[PDB]
Protein backbone atom coordinates (compact mmCIF):
# COMPACT_ATOMS: atom_id res chain seq x y z
CA UNK A 1 0.00 0.00 0.00
CA UNK A 2 1.01 3.57 -0.75
CA UNK A 3 0.52 4.94 2.76
CA UNK A 4 3.03 2.23 3.72
CA UNK A 5 4.94 2.64 0.48
CA UNK A 6 8.37 2.77 1.98
CA UNK A 7 9.77 0.57 4.50
CA UNK A 8 12.12 -1.19 2.13
CA UNK A 9 14.37 -3.39 4.31
CA UNK A 10 11.72 -4.26 6.88
CA UNK A 11 9.28 -5.55 4.30
CA UNK A 12 12.20 -6.93 2.30
CA UNK A 13 13.30 -9.12 5.19
CA UNK A 14 10.77 -10.02 7.75
CA UNK A 15 10.81 -13.77 7.14
CA UNK A 16 14.49 -14.43 7.71
CA UNK A 17 14.37 -13.43 11.37
CA UNK A 18 12.44 -16.57 12.50
CA UNK A 19 15.54 -18.54 11.50
CA UNK A 20 17.60 -16.15 13.61
CA UNK A 21 15.90 -17.46 16.75
CA UNK A 22 17.43 -20.89 16.20
CA UNK A 23 20.75 -19.09 15.83
CA UNK A 24 20.08 -17.04 18.96
CA UNK A 25 19.71 -20.27 20.92
CA UNK A 26 23.34 -21.17 20.25
CA UNK A 27 24.65 -17.73 21.17
CA UNK A 28 22.40 -17.88 24.22
CA UNK A 29 24.16 -21.18 24.84
CA UNK A 30 27.56 -19.67 24.02
CA UNK A 31 27.50 -17.19 26.89
CA UNK A 32 25.93 -19.78 29.19
CA UNK A 33 28.66 -22.02 27.84
CA UNK A 34 27.11 -25.47 27.66
Amino acid sequence: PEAYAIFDPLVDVLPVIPVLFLALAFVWQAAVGF
Binding site: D8, P9, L10, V13, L20, L24, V27, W28, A31, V32
Partner: peptide, 29 residues
Amino acid sequence: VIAQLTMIAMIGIAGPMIIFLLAVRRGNL
Protein backbone atom coordinates in the same frame (compact mmCIF):
# COMPACT_ATOMS: atom_id res chain seq x y z
CA VAL B 1 19.61 -1.92 -1.62
CA ILE B 2 22.59 -0.46 0.10
CA ALA B 3 20.24 2.00 1.66
CA GLN B 4 17.91 -0.97 2.00
CA LEU B 5 20.88 -3.16 2.92
CA THR B 6 21.85 -0.68 5.65
CA MET B 7 18.27 -0.64 6.81
CA ILE B 8 18.31 -4.43 7.12
CA ALA B 9 21.62 -4.44 9.01
CA MET B 10 20.29 -1.82 11.40
CA ILE B 11 16.82 -3.34 11.72
CA GLY B 12 17.36 -6.45 13.56
CA ILE B 13 20.59 -6.66 15.55
CA ALA B 14 18.91 -6.99 18.94
CA GLY B 15 19.94 -10.63 19.19
CA PRO B 16 23.63 -10.10 19.91
CA MET B 17 22.92 -6.76 21.59
CA ILE B 18 20.34 -8.39 23.87
CA ILE B 19 22.83 -11.01 25.01
CA PHE B 20 25.65 -8.49 25.46
CA LEU B 21 23.52 -6.18 27.58
CA LEU B 22 22.28 -9.19 29.52
CA ALA B 23 25.82 -10.49 29.86
CA VAL B 24 26.93 -7.14 31.28
CA ARG B 25 23.95 -7.19 33.64
CA ARG B 26 24.79 -10.76 34.75
CA GLY B 27 21.05 -11.21 35.03
CA ASN B 28 19.83 -14.77 34.53
CA LEU B 29 20.33 -17.53 31.97
